[PDB]
Structure formats: C-alpha cells, structure tokens
Amino acid sequence: ARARKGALVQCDPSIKALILQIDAKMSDIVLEELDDTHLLVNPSKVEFVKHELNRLLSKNIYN
C-alpha cells in the first residue's frame, strides 16, 4: 500500500554491523534494518558510507 525511496544496501553481516556503527556516530544514515544482510540507507549518504567503510577496513592499524 505504501512505497518509500531509498538505497538498498546488500552486504555481509560484519559489514552490516559496521554500517550501523557509522550510523550511530554520524546519524541520518540508516533508515531501516531490513534483514541480516540488507539495510535501507539514505540515498545521499551511500558514497559516504562506501568511503568510510573503505577507510575503516583499509586503514586499520592492525592489518
């Protein structure tokens, strides 16, 4: 009966957890948790999330 625009993000559970951590810090990122591997995210924040994930993973001093 209702539709809303957004960006669907499909990712592994560990990445889902990381995006939730990003949201908790920055807010206004995650619109809905959909399932263990899917989120609805603010479309204007998708590139931010992708860049931040890359930084979190690639720049980790314990790599």
Partner 1 sequence: IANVQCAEVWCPMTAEFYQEYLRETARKRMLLYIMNPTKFQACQFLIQYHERRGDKIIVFSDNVYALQEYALKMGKPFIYGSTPQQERMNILQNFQYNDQINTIFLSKVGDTSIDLPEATCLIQISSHYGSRRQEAQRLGRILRAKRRNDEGFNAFFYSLVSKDTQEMYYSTKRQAFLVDQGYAFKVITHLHGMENPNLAYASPRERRELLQEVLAGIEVDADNSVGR
Partner 2 sequence: ELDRVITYEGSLYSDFETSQEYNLLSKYAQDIGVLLWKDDKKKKFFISKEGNSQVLDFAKRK
CB 12 to partner 1: min, Å? 5
Alpha-carbon gap, residue 11 to 17, rounded angstroms: 10
CA angle 15-58-7, nearest 5°? 40
14-53 binders of partner 2 (CB under 8 A): 15, 32, 34-35, 38, 40-41, 43, 46, 50, 53
Residues 49/15, Cβ–Cβ less than 8 Å: no
Closer by beta carbon to partner 2, 25 or else 36? 36
Contact residues for partner 2 (CB under 8 A)?
1-12, 15, 32, 34-35, 38, 40-41, 43, 46, 50, 53-54, 57
